[PDB]
Amino acid sequence: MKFNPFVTSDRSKNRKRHFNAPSHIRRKIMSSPLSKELRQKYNVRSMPIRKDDEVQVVRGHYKGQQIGKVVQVYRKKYVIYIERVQREKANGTTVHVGIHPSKVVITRLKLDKDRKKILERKAKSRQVGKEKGK
Amino acid sequence: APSRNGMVLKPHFHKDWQRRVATWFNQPARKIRRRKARQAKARRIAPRPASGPIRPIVRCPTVRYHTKVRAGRGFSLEELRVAGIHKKVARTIGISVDPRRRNKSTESLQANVQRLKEYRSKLILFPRKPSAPKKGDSSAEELKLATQLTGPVMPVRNVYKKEKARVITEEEKNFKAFASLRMARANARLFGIRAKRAKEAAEQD
Amino acid sequence: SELAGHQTSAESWGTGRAVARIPRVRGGGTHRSGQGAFGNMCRGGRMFAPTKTWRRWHRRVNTTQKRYAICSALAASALPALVMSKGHRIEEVPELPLVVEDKVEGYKKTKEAVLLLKKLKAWNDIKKVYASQRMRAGKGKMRNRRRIQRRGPCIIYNEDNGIIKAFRNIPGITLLNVSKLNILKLAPGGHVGRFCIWTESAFRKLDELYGTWRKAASLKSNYNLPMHKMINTDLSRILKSPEIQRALRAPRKKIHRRVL
RNA sequence: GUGGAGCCGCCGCAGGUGCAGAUCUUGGUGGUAGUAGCAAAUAUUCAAACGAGAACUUUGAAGGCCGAAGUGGAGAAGGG
RNA sequence: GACCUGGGUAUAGGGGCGAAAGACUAAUCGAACCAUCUAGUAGCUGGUUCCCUCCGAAGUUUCCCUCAGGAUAGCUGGCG
RNA sequence: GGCGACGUCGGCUACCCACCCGACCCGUCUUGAAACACGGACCAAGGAGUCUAACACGUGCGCGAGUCGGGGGCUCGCACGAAAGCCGCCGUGGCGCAAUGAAGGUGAAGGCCGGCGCGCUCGCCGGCCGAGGUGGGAUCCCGAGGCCUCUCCAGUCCGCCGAGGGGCACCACCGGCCCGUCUCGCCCGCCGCGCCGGGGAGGUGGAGCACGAGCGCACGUGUUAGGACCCGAAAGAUGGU
RNA sequence: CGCGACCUCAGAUCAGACGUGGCGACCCGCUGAAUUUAAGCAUAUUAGUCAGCGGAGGAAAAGAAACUAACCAGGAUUCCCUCAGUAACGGCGAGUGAACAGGGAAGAGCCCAGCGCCGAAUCCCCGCCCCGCGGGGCGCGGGACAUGUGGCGUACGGAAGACCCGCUCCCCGGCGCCGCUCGUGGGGGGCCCAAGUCCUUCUGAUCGAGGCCCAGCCCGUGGACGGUGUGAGGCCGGUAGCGGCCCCCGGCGCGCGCCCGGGUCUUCCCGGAGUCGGGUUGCUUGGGAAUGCAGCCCAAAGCGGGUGGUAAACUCCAUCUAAGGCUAAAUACCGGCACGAGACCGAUAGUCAACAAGUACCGUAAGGGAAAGUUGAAAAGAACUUUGAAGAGAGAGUUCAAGAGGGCGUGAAACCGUUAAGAGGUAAACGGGUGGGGUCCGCGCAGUCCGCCCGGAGGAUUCAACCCGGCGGCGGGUCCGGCCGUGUCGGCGGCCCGGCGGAUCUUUCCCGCCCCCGGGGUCGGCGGGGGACCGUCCCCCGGACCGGCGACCGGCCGCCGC
RNA sequence: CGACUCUUAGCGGUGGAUCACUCGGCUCGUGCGUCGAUGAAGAACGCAGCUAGCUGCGAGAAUUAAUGUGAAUUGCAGGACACAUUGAUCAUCGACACUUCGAACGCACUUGCGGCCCCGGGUUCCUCCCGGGGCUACGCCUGUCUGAGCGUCGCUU
Ligand SMILES: [Mg+2]
Ligand SMILES: [Mg+2]
Ligand SMILES: [Mg+2]
Ligand SMILES: [Mg+2]
Ligand SMILES: [Mg+2]
Ligand SMILES: [Mg+2]
Ligand SMILES: [Mg+2]
Ligand SMILES: [Mg+2]
Ligand SMILES: [Mg+2]
């Protein structure tokens, strides 16, 4: 239950802060869980999705053990595009159908200098949660 | 517009009264506000007591209320003079001073003087760095509490006398009657007239 | 309705011109130019008797009736029929004023809360609260209350030592202090008899907080508990008493139907 | 049967609580009705070209009108 | 010709201006228009939204700048 | 007791049609509307007795000669909690518990017994008590008598019971008391003997007394003030273009 | 005649500063109607409100008595509850209508002119420097202000000087830095639980079912929102005196700057003018033989003046010290910047405005001022063929669905096309009564009864009766073990190691004092504490009843299941 | 027979009601409570690769620097992916910049007309010669400089 009297609990103001979101908040809210192999090696739960993560889809019409990299992350439409899941048009041109990153599981991160520093900070802040149990 | 047996009424709603309405919806919102104006003042001060200085014993005016005891404004100069403390040092002791108050009784003079010496003997001061003029050792063994509440020495304490039991004697069950009221009530109003007839027989020769 | 719908400049057309005598807006050009202005009839008009924010929202109840209802709200939570006929599944639970010992007030973690209610056989009422996890019927959903829910047991205590944190994650539950009880928690909906888990030190304090009929309440200055209008209240025993049925006539048990 | 995401019973509570009319308000649609009417200042006709398509466009010829206080040729105001 | 007319400029609401009609003053003139006071007031027109059960009238007395209205008595209903 | 299979049996509605009878179109003001009285072409949605204050009476609930925290105050910093709880040397105050008079002011207990002062149309002392009396008065109490398988001896009961008794609420009446006035009158009192105080007896004025019933909350109805059930002027004012 | 000073004044694009306008919800100064009410209308009421005009601020205004009071007296202002719909005003009609005590919120006080005193002991500006950061100075030398009076000590509660007497060495800011900040100081960022497990439905799941005797997992985290549909666990988040980061803030201790108070007596000092007040005239107020304010005229006093609510003269008493000034808090806020919420409204509602709304558009202008939400989960927005000049079709295709095809969710009625059925010279429609057809349902069609008991016909199993084992309940009983209710008490028991209550009592207890001759007298009390008594609630032994829905054990009866 | 008319029902159209949704109100509350000559509020104009509006901006014009963040913006193109350079984007915002009118300020408001001072080049320039820069409103305070007066007076002749 919410106790902080400075953060909302109404329906209409939480939606309005969702669809009018700034694009740096919008990478935070488009996060996806790591795979069960990979969340044990990094002891971190979920990550904001970027451009060349290997990834597979866990619910929807296109799902099931189809590791294949993302290629384009629309923040404005809250949608990643993955290189394999597509759709033929009536014209015959093939287009990417778009799926939301909550319905999607990272199977290989793309590490750079920053994705070390994001994982290490998200992992270090969990041992203090373990140290509280005294 | 009237009817059967009812009241004849003067509602004062002939003026534009919807503009000057005051609705108390913030009144719990302000009662929890001026609690915080007391708590964050009480810890703001010191171990100095909350609810301000010490007030005098003061009897109310106006015959309806003259039988009771109220807390006043300040002790004043006459009562400060006898107690021995200076008139401008008194408000850093914690004693409020009301210089425009008069003492014309002596019973109520000595009541607040007894009140004010009783206060100073249950007061402990803090010297800055411990030289202590007119103050002794460790502060009453850390002063037995921190901060007081709603009046230092319980400022109303409206007290009455015992007057246990007597035996009804002669000259007491005989005299002091209703007639002594009515005669004293008449002698106050025939007083100026009868002293005018007295002048008339003095100019009579 | 804020000011009014009276931020309109408008007059009646008055005379003939074959229109109603309602005020019409001024000007030309726009659609809104010969239309019915303020009055509780018009598209864009002013409502009938616009609601005023100085309505008497709040009600006084004199405090011996508040304490009358709070003695009647506690005494019905000891009768097993009234507390089970309000729906609280209290079949398997033992003795109806449930009192667990005062060690329960220092629970600090809700695993200890859950197996407590399981071993007091009161989890089967919390599990009923998960069954009423509907969403709201009606337009109250868009006014940010979307889920309706049954209220379950209420745990009533004194000297909170961490107990408030262990039980509040459990749904449908209530924690109220035994110094400061509440008619809105003990009798939800106005119906009497909510199931309650007392603690020892809460349960003993009731004797000094409402007083028995010999001695008044100690923590309440001038309150003694309300006397009865009936002493013996099972009148199936009174009407079968030998004092009553020595005095009666006889039943008159023909029918004497209509005679042709 | 349509429809596609919420809703209802009982016990109490609370109203911006139920329409046929107010020459009611706003919106919609009929009959009248394929009806009244598309009649101020004399007037058009032949061929051709372009075109899916011509009483009305362009062109050629004929017939006419404004007739120099113009239905001609230029401006101020206004329009932009 | 007490001629006509363009532009410039002056006069503003109980005020303008009038060879005088109470004419004219932005389609408005026996006192303009726009906004507010204002949801002005009406003893006077019009309207006044579900069912069933039970009871069921009055247009007369007296006073009123009273006669299209009200108070008052009578009739009516409900609680007892 | 009798009758009948793959198209028949039964059934009804917002189905359609026929026929006989009855039947003018609603709303409205009105003595009277189908009216040659007014409003309505048609459909959809909107649309008019509200809310606050005061008061009256009924009703429901808590306490009850009292009642009431509404204004503050206290409780760890708590979603719900702008809630709830508590105070009592926070009951100040409000209404009630006492009326009357313009006012100064005054301000609600009688009846019996025994005796005495001219038991004088007037009273005085002591005791008993204690809200007077009359007529009705639900209810309750007493009750001669009455009612039971064989006759005299006893028990609980029940029903009937003429008559008698204590009488609630309440009504009518008579009497009493308090306040204002009015007439007639006489006596008493003393922080001081007076253009001082107190009392009497009869008659009238009062929203009084005659063993308290109010207060708080809620709901209902009615009246009023408010825009006040909705809609409606001809006007008036300020300030501007 | 010249020159010098000073006073009155000018000028300047002088050096350095300042004011203007906006916003105006609240606040301050003026100005100010009428509609309306009185059933008419003038005084009155509306209303000192609307409009007009000027000034501010985060609050403003007020504010330390020329007060209230009339007694045992209170003691600045502001706000609340009362006082109170009251005293009073009023064609005494309609209507209007304050205050003081009292209870609270908050509480805080001060300064000048004057009278004297100190050799103007004072301030501004410039110049170079002590020496500095983020710039302000106390230090240095010049130009002004200023004696027509700057600064110090002083203010009505009195003050000053000189005595005498006993105390005493202080406070303020700046600078560094360490130690904390009560919700645990503020601001900003980026982080911190647990299923996407098995079956299953579906266009797609957040559905539905399942997880050992540890309750499948987390929980200080089951607020919420978004995700192909309803999500504690897939994702933001939310929980937590959770963690880590960056900046900003209030306050301890080294170096500047400032620094004799109090009591008693004696002597001296002691106050604001065209103001108070009076007249008259307007307005205003509840203010009435005038409450306030303003004009004009007259115009003071000094044991005075003002007030003391009925005009005046006399008197006594009370009370305050006017015509100069500052001041926080409690209070107001429908404008602003940020926020939270709701028994609210749901696109004819709610703001005029959910959208390119103060927008299109209208008026010369002031001003007026709308309409207008919805494809789908995802554009996957209908390629290609074909007819036609094209709109527009017919096929094909996407999608769960085009019966969602670009104002596209659902798609009502009025109105219109069509097909089907029925009918038709007293305009249609309706009431009542049957009839004929039709749509459709139910039975299922000369095939309808259902369970009860008994005697018939063969079949198939096992109890019953009876007893024994065995647990569990029903009812009665010594109230036996426990048990509690109500009156009676006692052990005054626990009263000093008992609770509360009492306007019971005790002038012998105990503490600070008054009344008379260092002491004393109960010698009568005062402030406080003690301990007896009474009233009620807590145990022990007896006794009283019922053992009442408070119970268990034994034994009895009769049920029951195994 | 057909047509016409009427009553029901199906189906199609007209129309946008109902229902379900809601990045909007409305109400109450809390915290702060900040404009302007150092040019505010407002107005006008302009600015995007393809851009009319709304929104955002000011010739540095759909944004610059910085800090935080750490791979997008997206209707289509285009371009740097460099990030153990400096790093896309977005938020924050403390540095810089901010056309014209407006209290509006040289004077007028007609883009009308100046006046001094200095600068880069032309008469190597005073006496009105191109561009640029600075200055020039009113009120008023303190001070300065200049000086009016048969104002008052001094010392003089
Ligand atoms: Mg909200
Ligand atoms: Mg609904
Ligand atoms: Mg009719
Ligand atoms: Mg006028
Ligand atoms: Mg400001
Ligand atoms: Mg619509
Ligand atoms: Mg940049
Ligand atoms: Mg220049
Ligand atoms: Mg000017």
Curated annotation (Swiss-Prot), chain A:
The keyword Cytoplasm applies. Its main location: cytoplasm. InterPro entries: KOW, Rib_uL2_dom2, Ribosomal_uL24_CS, Ribosomal_uL24_euk/arc, Ribosomal_uL24_KOW, Translation_prot_SH3-like_sf. GO terms for molecular function: mRNA 5'-UTR binding; RNA binding; structural constituent of ribosome. One of its GO terms (cellular component) is membrane. One of its GO terms (biological process) is cellular response to gamma radiation. Ufmylated by UFL1 in response to endoplasmic reticulum stress, promoting reticulophagy of endoplasmic reticulum sheets. It is found in: Cytoplasm. Keywords: Cytoplasm, Diamond-Blackfan anemia, Isopeptide bond, Phosphoprotein, Ribonucleoprotein, Ribosomal protein, Ubl conjugation. It is linked to Diamond-Blackfan anemia 11: A form of Diamond-Blackfan anemia, a congenital non-regenerative hypoplastic anemia that usually presents early in infancy. Diamond-Blackfan anemia is characterized by a moderate to severe macrocytic anemia, erythroblastopenia, and an increased risk of malignancy. 30 to 40% of Diamond-Blackfan anemia patients present with short stature and congenital anomalies, the most frequent being craniofacial (Pierre-Robin syndrome and cleft palate), thumb and urogenital anomalies. Component of the large ribosomal subunit. Interacts with DHX33. Component of the large ribosomal subunit. The ribosome is a large ribonucleoprotein complex responsible for the synthesis of proteins in the cell. Belongs to the universal ribosomal protein uL24 family. This is Large ribosomal subunit protein uL24. The gene is RPL26.
UniProtKB/Swiss-Prot annotation, chain B:
Higher levels of expression in benign breast lesions than in carcinomas. GO terms for molecular function: RNA binding; structural constituent of ribosome. It is found in: Cytoplasm. There is a cross-link at K173 (Glycyl lysine isopeptide (Lys-Gly) (interchain with G-Cter in SUMO1)). Component of the 60S large ribosomal subunit (LSU). PANTHER family: 60S RIBOSOMAL PROTEIN L13, LARGE RIBOSOMAL SUBUNIT PROTEIN EL13. This is Large ribosomal subunit protein eL13. The lineage of its organism: Eukaryota, Metazoa, Chordata, Craniata, Vertebrata. The gene is RPL13.
Curated annotation (Swiss-Prot), chain C:
The chain holds residues 55 to 314 of 427 of the full protein. Citrullinated by PADI4. One of its GO terms (cellular component) is cytosolic ribosome. One of its GO terms (biological process) is cytoplasmic translation. Its main location: cytoplasm. The modification Omega-N-methylarginine is found at R43. Component of the large ribosomal subunit. May bind IPO9 with low affinity. Interacts with RBM3. It is found in: Cytoplasm. The modification Phosphothreonine is found at T212. There is a cross-link at K185 (Glycyl lysine isopeptide (Lys-Gly) (interchain with G-Cter in SUMO2)). Signal peptide: none annotated. The modification Phosphoserine is found at S236, S241. Belongs to the universal ribosomal protein uL4 family. Component of the large ribosomal subunit. The ribosome is a large ribonucleoprotein complex responsible for the synthesis of proteins in the cell. Keywords: Acetylation, Citrullination, Cytoplasm, Isopeptide bond, Methylation, Phosphoprotein, Ribonucleoprotein, Ribosomal protein, Ubl conjugation. The modification N6-acetyllysine is found at K52, K205. This is Large ribosomal subunit protein uL4. The modification Citrulline is found at R246. It comes from Homo sapiens. GO terms for molecular function: RNA binding; structural constituent of ribosome.
